[PDB]
Design a protein around this ligand. Structure first.
Ligand SMILES: CCC[C@@H]1CN[C@H](C(=O)O)[C@H]1c1cccc(C(=O)O)c1
Ligand SMILES: CCC[C@@H]1CN[C@H](C(=O)O)[C@H]1c1cccc(C(=O)O)c1
Ligand SMILES: [Cl-]
Ligand SMILES: [Cl-]
Ligand SMILES: [Cl-]
Ligand SMILES: [Cl-]
Lengths: 255, 252
């Protein structure tokens, strides 16, 4: 009797969302989105049953000063989940404590800002002070700036952290609202930017990607599923299914 | 002990260093992958001996299912590591353990500048301009199996007339582009390398799929995860990007 895998995930549009329904929904049927479609495709290739559970603390995964982890990462470390199927960024510190699959998405930091401005790059942002710019506090983008030894990015981190980190935002949602309302440019993961620009015709991605990273399925260290999940991901990649899935959930109504 | 690294001669990843005197050992070679190997060695603290794969192949299966190239060196435990632009594919990942990718890339089009061709679709709608790919390589496999209508049509063209539109390898493909009316579909890293050095040529459109290059290790290697963690370190330090710019920089 094959065991049902527990899948930890997080509410995050368009990866995982409650489905709209005129009757109560139960189990996996409660949810829809990119990561649900991904799960269905993985399950079809590998032949496993699964149980989607929202991570209780609603976090991706970071460690405090005591080395203790939270979020989906912690669920995996503690073996309360078999897989984390979510847009979990593959980072050095996370890869040390869990086994990531190969990336099902590749992306990077870029800029979300208004159209029709003199800004065309990170360097354009860096050499001025009138247009405020920043990032989500304590996220992947912030870490990149905090740790970069590139002159242009060091100067941007200095600006970002000045005035008691006023230029930083709490999370991606508040950042996007800030762009929409005030004169503010948001540095963030490009996936998030694409989703927004598809839906907000007055905003745009500026410059290219300034680094590179992927999203991977998380599994516990020593997981017997990680290598199989990787091979399934590569199969979906080569057959063009990941690309199709991304387009399905990202594409807006046109601008 | 010293790790044996299998690799392959391929510009600008691995090249014989130019010298007025004989060179020996690792000092014989230079390129992006040697720079990568240096950085990995610095982080993980291993010594290494670089050895060109005898058959000068990346890794594919013959009709009897036998593997060749760097992949085979790994399967047979004749090398600890493959540090080369080894494309992470479904069939290869089944028989060796790949690191996370140190480069991400995709299929694109190499062609002459200034033409009305702007996408694969523009090629597929016509037959005057020949187009194809390297026979039996990664690009071909994508077309061979795609169920996108436009790519299905292109594969039928490529495979027609005794595969006249296919080429033996990337180098001959590139020559075919420079001398005749021919568009080559291939890995974008190769296209970027060429177009930095030949202002006659350009990339058409964007990437029509996605894939990475990974360090290869034999299945079960304890180095795979350590190498992956080192790659993520270099990625986050911005070092991989730096190394790419160094070796690719050379047109309007
Ligand atoms: C909307 C997608 C959330 C993304 C999905 N991947 C990131 C993660 O795995 O932690 C989330 C994250 C958290 C906080 C800040 C950023 C950022 O872009 O600078 C990203
Ligand atoms: C110049 C670098 C050779 C690349 C490096 N990565 C590929 C590999 O690992 O097999 C090589 C390869 C072999 C045959 C055809 C193609 C293609 O682009 O369609 C690529
Ligand atoms: Cl739940
Ligand atoms: Cl991996
Ligand atoms: Cl040699
Ligand atoms: Cl091959």
């Amino acid at each position: 009797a094959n065991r049902t895998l527990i899948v930890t995930t997080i509410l995050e549009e368009p990866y995982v969302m409650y489905r709209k329904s005129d009757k109560p929904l139960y189990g996996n049927d409660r949810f829809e989105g990119y990561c649900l479609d991904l799960l269905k495709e993985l399950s079809n290739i590998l032949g496993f049953l699964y149980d989607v559970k929202l991570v209780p603390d609603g976090k991706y995964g970071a460690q405090n000063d005591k080395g203790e982890w939270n979020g989906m990462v912690k669920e995996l470390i503690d073996h309360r989940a078999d897989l984390a199927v979510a847009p979990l960024t593959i980072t050095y510190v996370r890869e040390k404590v869990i086994d990531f699959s190969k990336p099902f998405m590749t992306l990077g930091i870029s800029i979300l800002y208004r159209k029709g401005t003199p800004i065309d790059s990170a360097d354009d942002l860096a050499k001025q002070t009138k247009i405020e710019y920043g990032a989500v506090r304590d996220g992947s983008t912030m870490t990149f700036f905090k740790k970069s030894k590139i002159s242009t990015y060091e100067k941007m981190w200095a600006f970002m952290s000045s005035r008691q980190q006023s230029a930083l935002v709490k999370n991606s949602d508040e950042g996007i609202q800030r762009v929409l309302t005030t004169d503010y440019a948001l540095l963030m993961e490009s996936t998030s930017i694409e989703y927004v620009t598809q839906r907000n015709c007055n905003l745009t991605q500026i410059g290219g990607l300034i680094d590179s990273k992927g999203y991977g399925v998380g599994t516990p260290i020593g997981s017997p599923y990680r290598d199989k999940i990787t091979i399934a991901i590569l199969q979906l990649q080569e057959e063009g299914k990941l690309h199709m899935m991304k387009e399905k959930w990202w594409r807006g109504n046109g601008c």
